[PDB]
Design an enzyme around this catalytic site. Sequence first.
Site, mmCIF file in Angstrom:
data_model
loop_
_atom_site.group_PDB
_atom_site.id
_atom_site.type_symbol
_atom_site.label_atom_id
_atom_site.label_comp_id
_atom_site.label_asym_id
_atom_site.label_seq_id
_atom_site.Cartn_x
_atom_site.Cartn_y
_atom_site.Cartn_z
ATOM 1 N N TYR B 23 0.848 -1.173 0.000
ATOM 2 C CA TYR B 23 0.000 0.000 0.000
ATOM 3 C C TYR B 23 0.891 1.233 0.000
ATOM 4 C CZ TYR B 23 -4.277 2.693 0.862
ATOM 5 O OH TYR B 23 -5.334 3.561 0.662
ATOM 6 N N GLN B 26 2.393 3.373 -5.491
ATOM 7 C CA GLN B 26 1.477 2.783 -6.486
ATOM 8 C C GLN B 26 0.354 2.003 -5.837
ATOM 9 O OE1 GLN B 26 1.413 2.949 -10.073
ATOM 10 N NE2 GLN B 26 2.854 4.675 -9.804
ATOM 11 N N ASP B 81 10.824 -2.942 -5.644
ATOM 12 C CA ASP B 81 11.346 -3.917 -6.600
ATOM 13 C C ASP B 81 12.323 -4.832 -5.919
ATOM 14 O OD1 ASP B 81 10.132 -3.106 -9.237
ATOM 15 O OD2 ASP B 81 11.082 -1.141 -8.679
ATOM 16 N N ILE B 83 12.553 -5.974 -2.948
ATOM 17 C CA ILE B 83 11.975 -6.946 -2.015
ATOM 18 C C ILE B 83 10.878 -7.824 -2.644
ATOM 19 C CG2 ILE B 83 12.625 -5.576 0.142
ATOM 20 C CD1 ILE B 83 9.534 -6.432 -0.044
ATOM 21 N N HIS B 106 6.066 -2.614 -13.037
ATOM 22 C CA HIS B 106 7.407 -2.345 -13.618
ATOM 23 C C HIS B 106 7.935 -3.681 -13.946
ATOM 24 C CE1 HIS B 106 11.283 -0.405 -14.317
ATOM 25 N NE2 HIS B 106 11.805 -0.612 -13.096
#
EC number: 1.1.1.86
Lengths: 326, 325
Positions: B23, B26, B81, B83, B106
Site C-alpha cells: 500500500y 502505487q 522492486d 523486495i 514495472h
Amino acid sequence: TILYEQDVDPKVIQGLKVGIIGYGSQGHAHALNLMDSGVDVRVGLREGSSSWKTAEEAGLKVTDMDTAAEEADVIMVLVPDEIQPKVYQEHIAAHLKAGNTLAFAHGFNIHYGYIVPPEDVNVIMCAPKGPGHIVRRQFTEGSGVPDLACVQQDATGNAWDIVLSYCWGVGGARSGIIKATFAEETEEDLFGEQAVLCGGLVELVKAGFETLTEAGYPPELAYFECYHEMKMIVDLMYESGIHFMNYSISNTAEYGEYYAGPKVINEQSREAMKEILKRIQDGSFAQEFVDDCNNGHKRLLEQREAINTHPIETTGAQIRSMFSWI
Amino acid sequence: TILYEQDVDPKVIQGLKVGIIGYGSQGHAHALNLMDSGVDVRVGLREGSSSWKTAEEAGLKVTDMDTAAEEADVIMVLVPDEIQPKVYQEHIAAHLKAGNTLAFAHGFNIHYGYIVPPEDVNVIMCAPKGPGHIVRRQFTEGSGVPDLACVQQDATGNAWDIVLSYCWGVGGARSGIIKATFAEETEEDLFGEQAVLCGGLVELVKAGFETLTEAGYPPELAYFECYHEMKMIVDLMYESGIHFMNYSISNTAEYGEYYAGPKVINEQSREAMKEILKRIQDGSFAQEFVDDCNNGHKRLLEQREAINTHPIETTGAQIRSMFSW
Ligand SMILES: NC(=O)c1ccc[n+]([C@@H]2O[C@H](COP(=O)([O-])OP(=O)(O)OC[C@H]3O[C@@H](n4cnc5c(N)ncnc54)[C@H](OP(=O)(O)O)[C@@H]3O)[C@@H](O)[C@H]2O)c1
Ligand SMILES: NC(=O)c1ccc[n+]([C@@H]2O[C@H](COP(=O)([O-])OP(=O)(O)OC[C@H]3O[C@@H](n4cnc5c(N)ncnc54)[C@H](OP(=O)(O)O)[C@@H]3O)[C@@H](O)[C@H]2O)c1
Ligand SMILES: [Mg+2]
Ligand SMILES: [Mg+2]
Ligand SMILES: [Mg+2]
Ligand SMILES: [Mg+2]
C-alpha cells in the site's frame, strides 16, 4: 526577506488609476487581476487591435495607448522589451505628469539604459516570477505568483508603498514579495529562463526524447516518458519538496536519480551556467538579443520554426488531442 | 499505437477479484482507483502495519498478504522492486492457482530474472507513467495517467483483455494505453527517471540554484526563480505544447531558451544519456542498484540525507509554509 499580505496596504493601489499598455501575456494578467482587486484599470492598445475586443469582452475599459497614459497615475508597460523604447517615446513620455509612476514587469530597459524616465515620476517594477497565463490562473484559483518589487526612482516618497500594493493587486502577497533592485531582477530573471526554466528544461526533455527515439523506442512512448510525466514530478516538488517527490517515486528511481543527475548535468553544464551568467552581467547577452530584434528576429524565428516542427511537438499535439476527461 | 476506452472492455476486470500486495505509492493508487471503478479489491499488508488503518479508513478491504493472494484472481505486486522476490516466494507463489494472473507495475524483476512464475498463470504489467500519488490524484479529477500494458505469459488466452481492462480501471484509457514488452517498459522507464525526470531535472534545478547563490543572490530569490517557477512552465508545456509555452513567455526568454539550452544540455550531457541507456540495456545499472540494496541501501540513504539537507530544501520548506492558500 519575504513580504506577505500583512506587510502591504491594498488601499494604496486601490486609490490610483492604472494604465496597462499592452494586452499580451503579462498585460492581460495584470489588467484582470488588478480589476478583480478593485483597482480602476484601463488597457491601452493600438486602434483596431485584435486584442481590443478580447479585453473588452473580459470586462475591461480599453482605449488607445495615449489616452491610457494620459488618464493613468501608474503606467505599466507590458509590450515586448525590444518595442518598449519606441512605444514609450511615441505614446507614453509626453503624457507623464510630475507625481505619476512608470512601472515595468522586467528591468531590462531601465537597467540597460534604453529608457531614461524624467525626474519627477516614480520608476518601479513588479516582476512576477511566472509566465503571464499562470499569473492570471493562479490568482483566479486563490493562489498567486510571487513577485519581485523594485524602485529605481522615488519622486513621490511613497514608491515603495505603491509597488508593494500593486504586487498585492496581482497576487504576489499570497506567495511572497521580495524587494530587489532593477539590476538584480534583470540578471536573475535572464539567468533563470536561460539556464533552468526554458533553456535547460526544454533541451533536457528534447535530449531524452531523441535518445529514446534514436535507440528505437516509439515516439509516443518517448513523449509519455520524458515529456508528459515531467509535470507530475514537478507538481510534487512544487507542493511538497524534493524530499516528498523522492518519497513518492520508487527506490529504483530515487537511486537512479542520485546516480544519473550529475552525469547529465555535468561539470561542463555548470561551467555553461557560469558563462550564461557572465554574459548576462556584462550586457553581452542583452546586446545579442537587441541585435537580433533589429535584424527582423531572424535567429529567434528560425529557432522557433525548428522547435515547432520537431517530432516531440508533432507527436505531442496528436497525443494531447486524444485525451478525454470524465 | 495508442488505445483508449473504446479499445478496452471494463467488464473483464470488473469480473475478477484483485489483490494488491502493498500500500505504498502505487499500491494505494491502484487499490483506490480499481475500488472506484467497481472492482472487487483487497489490499494485502503485514499484520500491524501503519498502512493497515489508513487503507481501511479509505474504505478498502485489508487482509494479510497470504490471504489477499489466496482470495484473488489477479495478484498485483506493489512492494519495492528489491523486495518482490522475497515477498513473492514467501507470501504469493504458493497461493497461485492455474488460471490466476500475476501482475506488476514495472518489469524489473521479471526482465532481469529475479522472479520466475509458474507455467499456468498469466504474467502481465500495467505500468503507469507517473508517480503513485499522481496516478490517484488525476483519476479523482477525471483524468488518468497513461499506462504501458504488457503480457509476458498468457496461460488463459485472454491476458491481453485482462491487462487492458486493468489499465482502464486505473485511469489509463483517459490519456492512452500503449502495448509494450516487459523489456521495453523496464528499459524506457529506468532511462526516463534517470536521464530526464528525476536525475536530470533535480540536478538542473540544483545547479541553477547553486549558480545564483554562489554568485551572491539570496536563496529565497533563487528558489522562486529556479524551482518554484518550473511548475508553471511545465504546466503550459503539458497542456498546450512547447509552442504555446514559448508564446506565453517573453521574446527575451524565448531567445534565451534557444541560445542557452544546448550550452547547459551539451554534447557531454547527450553522451551521458547514451551511457545511461547502455548500462540499463546491459543490466549493469540493475546489478549496481540490487548490490546497494543488499548493502543496507547504504548509497541511496547517504545521497537522500545530502539532498534532504541541501539549502534548496531548507529554503523551500520555509517558503512553502508561508503560502496563504
Ligand atoms: N511573458 C511573461 O510571462 C513575462 C514574465 C514576467 C515579465 N515579463 C515582462 O513583461 C513585459 C511584457 O512581456 P509580454 O511577454 O507580456 O509581452 P507580449 O505578450 O509579447 O506583448 C504583446 C503586447 O504588445 C503589443 N505590441 C506588440 N508589438 C507592438 C508595437 N510595435 N507597438 C505597440 N504594441 C505592440 C501587442 O499588441 P496587440 O495586442 O495589438 O497585438 C500585445 O498587446 C516585458 O517587459 C517582459 O519581460 C514577461
Ligand atoms: N513509485 C512510483 O510512482 C512507481 C511508478 C510506476 C511503477 N512503480 C513500480 O511499482 C512497484 C511498487 O513501487 P512503490 O514505489 O509503490 O513501492 P513503495 O511505495 O516503496 O512500497 C511500500 C509498500 O511496500 C511494503 N513493503 C516494504 N518493505 C516490505 C517488506 N520487507 N515486506 C512486505 N512489504 C514491504 C510497505 O509496507 P508498509 O505499508 O507496512 O510499510 C508498503 O506497503 C515497483 O515495481 C515500482 O517499480 C512505481
Ligand atoms: Mg521571469
Ligand atoms: Mg523574463
Ligand atoms: Mg516510470
Ligand atoms: Mg520506475
